[PDB]
A paper describes a structure:
The MSNagA protein in the absence of ligand crystallized in space group P1 with four molecules in the asymmetric unit. Although no divalent cations were added during the purification steps, well defined electron density corresponding to two bound metal ions was clearly visible in the cavity of the (α/β) barrel buried at the bottom of the active-site cleft. Each MSNagA monomer in both the ligand-free and ligand-bound models contains two metal ions positioned between 3.1 and 3.4 Å apart from each other. Given that the same protein expressed in M. smegmatis contains predominantly zinc, it was decided to model the metal-binding sites as zinc rather than iron (see “Experimental procedures”). In all chains of the apo-structure, the metal ion that is more buried (M1) makes four interactions coordinated by the side chains His-56, His-58, Glu-122, and Asp-267. The second metal ion (M2) is held in position by the side chains of residues His-188, Glu-122, and His-209. Coordination is completed by water molecules with one water molecule modeled as bridging both of the metals and another bound to M1. In both of the MSNagA crystal structures, the protein forms a homodimer burying a total of 3,200 Å2 of the surface area. The carbonyl group of the GlcNAc6P substrate is positioned ∼2.5 Å from the M1 metal ion, which is ideally primed to stabilize the transition state intermediate formed during catalysis. It is of interest to note, by comparison of the apo- and ligand-bound structures, that there is little conformational change in the binding pocket upon substrate binding to MSNagA.
Author numbering:
A (entry chain B), B (entry chain A): 0 to 377
Write the structure that this text describes.
C-alpha cells in the first residue's frame, strides 16, 4: 500500500542505512537495509525514522490536564504530544480524594477505549507526604484494598500502573494485590529505605517512578530506593531528561548501571507543555518561568516538565555520551522499546506485524512527520 | 622445585579445580588444572589458593604507625598484614607539615628499598579542610610545585600514589606534575564538583581515594566526585568493605557501575588492626577503638578500619551478591589484580613467570598459610 524509504531506519533492535519499510494496512509488513524490494512510494531524504515515542508517565499538555477527565482537555493534551511523535500515552493522575479518583478513572477509561490514550497511571494518592512535590500531602492515605478494588473495577482493566510508597502500612500487600490484577506496581514519592524498597520489589514492583526525584538520595550508609531499584534486573527505572530534574551525568551514570534495556524515558509533562510561561493549575498552582520551568507557586519545588518526548529524546542522544548512531539506538530503546515492555504494551519494535507507529526526524533530530496506525498525523 | 596442589586455585583469570602450581625459587614456573604432572611436595587439602593480597592504602597495624617512619613500627605493621596474606603494601601517610613530611618520606623510602613495603601513598596534605576526618585540617595546604618536587626527590621514586583534592588552587597542575613523575594521582578528601573531578581525571588522575568516604555525596543536581570517578574507564576506585565505612549495597552498586576490573579493595587499616581496644593516637589524633570500630575519639567519624585484606576479601565475597565461585573470581580481581595494576605494581596474577605470592584459605575462607617470594611466611 505504502512503501517508505529513508537514509536511517531504527527498528528498535537494528540500525538500517539506508532503510525501507512496507506498511500496507495498519501493520508493518517488512523492514530491511539497502534498496527496497520494489519501487518506493515516498522516498524520504536525509532524515531518520524512529518508532513512535511511548510516554508512560505524563499529566497533560497543550493546556489540557488529564486529571480533568474531560473529552476536551484530554484531546488537547493528546493533540500536542501526538504532534511531537508520542504515539502511545499513559495518562497519570496525581493524588486525589476517593470520590474524584473514581470519577477521573471512569472518565479517562472511556478515552482509552476510544483510543486517544493507551492507559492510566495512578501517581498517588498512596504516596509519602514527606516527598510530595506537586502533590497535596493532606489527601495522601494508606493503600486500602477496598478502594484499590473499586478503582480497577471502575477502570475496567484500564489502570496500567500505580505508584506506591513502600513505607506505608499495607504497601506490600497492595503491591501484591495490584500485580495479581495485572497492574504494574511502581515505587516513588517515598522516604522508604533500601530494605523497604527491596521488599517492595520482591512483592512485585517492576518500575521506578522518576528516579532521583521525590526520592530519598543515595547515602553511603543508607542507599535508599534508587539503589534497590537499579540493583534488581526486574525493575525499569524512569528518568526525566529535560535538563532540569537531574544532571546529565546522573542519566549517564544510571544507564551505565542498569544497561540498555532497563531505563525508560518519560516527560512527566504538565499542562503547560507547548504553551507559554504563566500561572497554571495541577491540583495546587504552578508558575512557569525560564524555558517552561514550572515550580509549585513560590517553592522551588519542581512540578513536572514542560518537555515533549521529542525533546527528551534529543537530550538523551546528546547527553548519553555515545556517538550519534549508538546514541540513537540507545535512546530508541529507552524512549520506545523499554517503556512499552515494562508496562506490557504492544512491542514498539518496527518489525513485520507491529503497528505502524513511527516518527520522522531530520539531521538535528527535530520531528518532521509522525505516523500512527499507518496514517500520517503530521 | 616445589609442586603444590590444592582443590581450588584462583590465578586471577581462571578457576582451577583442582589445581597445581610449579614454583622454583621465588617465581611461578607453571600452572594448570587437574592432577599435577608429578607428585606434589605440599598437598593442600580442602583449601582455596588465592593470589597474594595487594593493599594499596593502609596506615599501620599491630600497634605500628607508618607515619612514624621507624624500622620497628613499620616492621610490626608489615608483619601483621603479611601474616594475613597482604604480600604487597603501599604505606599511607596522613596529612602533615612540610618538615615532618620530608622526614617520614625518607624514612619510609628506606623501608621500600629494604623490602618491608612496596611504595608510599601520600593521603594529604593537599586536601580539603571541610572533609578532614582523622586529619588535622589546619595542616592541609594548596599543592605547591616546589614542595611536591622536594617530596618526590626525597622518596627517590618510592612515592607511588598521592591523593589530591581537585578543588584546591593548583590541583590540576599538581596532578599533571605527579603523573609526569610516574606517580599515581588519586582523587579524595574533596568537595570537588562533578566538573572539577572530571577535570582532574582528564589531567591524569586514575584512582578514587576510598569512594563515598571523605567525599561529597551523590546528588541529583550536583552529582559530585563519585560519579565522575565511576564514569571514566581510566579510573580504579578503592572501597573499604569492612562493614563499617560503606553499606554492602553501595559496594554492590559501584561494582555494577564500574565493572569487575575497576574497583580495588583496600583496608585503610590503622595501627589497632590485630591489637585490642584502647586509644591509639594516630596522625597526632586520639583515636578511640571501641569494638574494632576505631573512630576519632569523640565524634562518630570513623578513622580508618581495623581490617586486613583477608577480612575485606571475605566481606566482598559474602556481600557481592554473586554465587560462590563468581564471588571468589570477582574478589580476587578486586583484592589482587585491580590494585596492583592501578599503581603499576608487579602483576599479582598467579601465572608462569610471576612471583610466588599466594594465600591458603580453609572452608570458611580464613587464611591458613601465606607464601611470599616462594617461601612460607606462615
Ligand atoms: Zn512525581
Ligand atoms: Zn508525575
Ligand atoms: Zn582518607
Ligand atoms: Zn587513609
Amino acid at each position: 500500500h505504502m512503501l517508505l524509504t529513508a537514509d536511517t531506519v531504527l527498528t528498535g533492535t537494528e540500525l538500517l542505512r539506508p532503510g525501507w519499510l512496507e506498511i500496507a494496512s495498519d501493520r508493518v509488513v517488512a523492514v530491511g537495509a539497502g534498496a527496497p524490494p520494489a519501487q518506493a512510494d515516498r522516498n524520504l531524504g536525509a532524515a531518520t525514522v524512529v518508532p513512535g515515542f511511548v510516554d508512560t508517565h505524563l499529566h497533560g499538555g497543550g493546556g489540557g490536564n488529564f486529571s480533568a477527565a474531560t473529552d476536551d482537555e484530554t484531546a488537547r493534551a493528546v493533540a500536542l504530544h501526538r504532534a511531537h511523535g508520542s504515539t502511545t500515552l499513559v495518562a497519570s493522575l496525581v493524588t486525589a480524594g476517593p470520590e474524584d479518583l473514581l470519577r477521573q478513572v471512569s472518565g479517562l477509561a472511556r478515552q482509552v477505549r476510544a483510543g486517544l490514550i493507551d492507559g492510566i497511571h495512578l501517581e498517588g494518592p498512596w504516596l509519602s507526604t514527606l516527598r510530595c512535590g506537586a502533590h497535596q500531602p493532606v489527601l495522601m492515605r494508606d493503600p486500602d484494598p477496598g478502594e484499590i478494588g473499586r478503582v480497577l473495577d471502575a477502570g475496567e482493566g484500564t489502570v496500567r500502573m500505580v505508584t506506591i510508597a513502600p513505607e506505608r502500612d499495607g504497601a506490600l500487600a497492595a503491591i501484591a494485590q495490584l500485580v495479581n490484577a495485572g497492574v504494574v506496581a511502581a515505587v516513588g514519592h517515598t522516604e522508604a529505605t533500601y530494605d523497604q524498597t527491596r521488599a517492595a520489589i520482591d512483592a512485585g514492583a517492576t518500575v521506578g517512578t522518576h528516579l532521583f526525584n521525590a526520592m530519598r538520595p543515595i547515602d553511603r550508609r543508607e542507599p535508599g530506593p534508587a539503589v534497590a531499584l537499579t540493583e534488581d534486573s526486574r525493575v525499569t527505572v524512569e528518568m526525566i531528561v529535560d535538563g532540569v530534574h537531574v544532571a546529565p551525568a546522573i542519566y549517564r551514570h544510571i544507564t551505565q548501571t542498569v544497561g540498555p534495556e532497563r531505563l525508560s524515558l518519560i516527560t512527566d509533562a504538565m499542562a503547560a507543555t507547548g504553551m507559554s510561561d504563566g500561572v497554571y493549575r495541577l491540583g495546587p498552582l504552578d508558575i512557569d518561568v525560564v524555558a517552561g520551568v514550572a515550580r509549585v507557586a513560590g517553592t522551588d519545588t519542581i512540578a513536572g516538565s514542560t518537555a515533549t518526548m521529542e525533546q527528551v529524546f534529543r537530550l538523551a542522544v546528546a547527553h548519553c555520551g555515545l556517538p550519534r548512531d549508538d546514541a540513537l539506538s540507545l535512546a530508541v530503546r529507552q524512549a520506545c522499546v523499554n517503556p512499552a515492555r515494562a508496562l506490557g504494551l504492544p512491542a514498539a519494535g518496527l518489525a513485520a506485524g507491529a503497528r505502524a507507529d513511527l516518527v520522522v526526524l531530520d539531521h538535528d533530530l527535530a520531528v518532521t512527520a509522525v505516523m500512527r496506525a499507518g496514517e500520517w498525523v503530521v
